[PDB]
Amino acid sequence: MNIFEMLRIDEGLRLKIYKDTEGYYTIGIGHLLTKSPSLNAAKSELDKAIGRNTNGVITKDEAEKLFNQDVDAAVRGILRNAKLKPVYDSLDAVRRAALINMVAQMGETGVAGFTNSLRMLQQKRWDEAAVNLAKSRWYNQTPNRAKRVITTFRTGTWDAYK
Ligand SMILES: [Cl-]
Ligand SMILES: [Cl-]
Numbered sequence: 001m002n003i004f005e006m007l008r009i010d011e012g013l014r015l016k017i018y019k020d021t022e023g024y025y026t027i028g029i030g031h032l033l034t035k036s037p038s039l040n041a042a043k044s045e046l047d048k049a050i051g052r053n054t055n056g057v058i059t060k061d062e063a064e065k066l067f068n069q070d071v072d073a074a075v076r077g078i079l080r081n082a083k084l085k086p087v088y089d090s091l092d093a094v095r096r097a098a099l100i101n102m103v104a105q106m107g108e109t110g111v112a113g114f115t116n117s118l119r120m121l122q123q124k125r126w127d128e129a130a131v132n133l134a135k136s137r138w139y140n141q142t143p144n145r146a147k148r149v150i151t152t153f154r155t156g157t158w159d160a161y162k
Contacts, residue, residue, distance in 0.1 A: 001158040003071060003097045007104055009161055010145050013063060017042055017056040021142055027056075028063035030104065031070060074103045083112040090122050098152040105145075106138065121153065130154040 011030030017039070020026045025033045025042035033045045043056050050062055078084045078099065088099055099121075102111050112118075114136070120129035130150045133139065139146040151160040 001161055003100050006097055006161055007101060010101065015058055015060065015063060017046065027058060029067045031066045070104060074100050077108045078103055081108050081112060083118065084108065087118050087122050092156055094156050094158065095153055098149050101149050126154045
């Protein structure tokens with residue numbers, strides 16, 4: 001198991017523009033296109049992202065390319081983030097993947113907002129962190145995905161994904 005496989009399980013793969021759980025225009029493997037309510041705006045961000053008139057449809061390779069870019073950016077964003085970096089550095093390889101997952105789903109800003117949980121993670125207080133992570137909108141809006149990530153932080157294994 002690795003970050004790519006993990007997010008692929010969590011986000012699925014869709015080759016046509018679709019709406020995510022929050023109703024935002026997305027495509028591929030969870031690649032947010034825009035928060036604007038306009039399809040046209042979404043189709044426009046899409047072509048710009050891919051570099052051609054796609055007409056709201058991409059190929060598998062193209063999806064994967066966005067995916068690679070997304071993962072890399074998530075990592076780099078964590079590393080440049082003063083709040084996140086320290087946590088990430090304190091974690092083992094499996095738990096780092098869990099933090100990347102949250103960043104890919106909710107953005108750096110979002111994650112950096114889990115101040116209390118981050119501190120517990122840094123302190124290696126697994127059970128307490130998992131309880132705190134659960135008290136959030138994130139957990140209430142996407143409970144299945146959140147349970148998988150939380151379990152990963154709690155156990156340090158890939159069990160929730162096997
Ligand atoms: Cl892009
Ligand atoms: Cl879910």
